[PDB]
């Protein structure tokens, strides 16, 4: 008598892209020439800060996300399943209040998912 995964969850997301993509363009830089390994270093760097509580995810997502989502704070409030990608959904809906998925690798870049609520 339980629901298969939550129906709606709130999770904030950060996106770091890399050269290997169909569009290596950012809002803070023209051509993203950073390779995957460089992106990994960046991602892991934030992942540690998020656990230790060095910098706030909202501030990170609003600055380090190559996507326009940075200006959207990085948070999308409570979202349903049919709003996110398959890998994102699996990770986001598997995070409880305080959990962080980490590096979600997609073709459009690496997404960091943190359960804010």
């Amino acid at each position: 008598g339980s629901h298969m995964e939550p129906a709606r969850v709130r999770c904030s997301h950060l996106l770091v892209k890399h050269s290997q993509s169909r569009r290596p363009s950012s809002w803070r830089q023209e051509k993203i020439t950073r390779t995957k390994e460089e992106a990994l270093e960046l991602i892991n760097g934030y992942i540690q800060k998020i656990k230790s509580g060095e910098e706030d995810f909202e501030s990170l997502a609003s600055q380090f996300s190559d996507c326009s989502s940075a200006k959207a704070r990085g948070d999308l409030g409570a979202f349903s399943r049919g709003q996110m990608q398959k890998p994102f959904e699996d990770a986001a809906f598997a995070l409880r209040t305080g959990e962080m998925s980490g590096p979600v690798f997609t073709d459009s870049g690496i997404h960091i998912i943190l359960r804010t609520e």
Side-chain angles (χ1 to χ4, degrees):
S2 298
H3 290 251
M4 55 289 182
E5 298 92 73
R8 190 174 303 187
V9 300
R10 173 184 170 197
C11 302
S12 307
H13 63 177
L14 193 160
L15 175 62
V16 175
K17 302 174 183 293
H18 54 115
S19 42
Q20 302 76 28
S21 56
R22 82 291 175 223
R23 185 57 55 204
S25 307
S26 185
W27 63 271
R28 57 177 301 143
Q29 59 176 210
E30 183 181 276
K31 182 183 180 180
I32 304 178
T33 43
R34 76 183 83 113
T35 190
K36 178 176 180 176
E37 295 177 68
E38 298 299 279
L40 261 303
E41 289 304 290
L42 297 174
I43 297 296
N44 281 272
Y46 307 132
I47 294 180
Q48 292 297 31
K49 290 180 171 182
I50 301 169
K51 291 194 295 296
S52 184
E54 306 301 283
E55 296 185 84
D56 292 273
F57 191 87
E58 288 182 74
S59 186
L60 299 178
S62 301
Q63 294 180 148
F64 298 113
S65 300
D66 297 292
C67 50
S68 48
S69 189
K71 289 297 183 179
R73 195 67 182 171
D75 182 88
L76 310 88
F79 57 84
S80 304
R81 298 187 64 144
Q83 302 179 211
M84 294 296 180
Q85 293 300 272
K86 298 299 294 295
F88 192 106
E89 177 195 78
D90 183 84
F93 288 84
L95 301 179
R96 294 173 57 186
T97 309
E99 295 191 277
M100 176 179 54
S101 185
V104 182
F105 303 87
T106 59
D107 292 90
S108 304
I110 310 174
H111 301 247
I112 306 178
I113 310 176
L114 175 66
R115 184 78 191 252
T116 41
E117 206 298 286

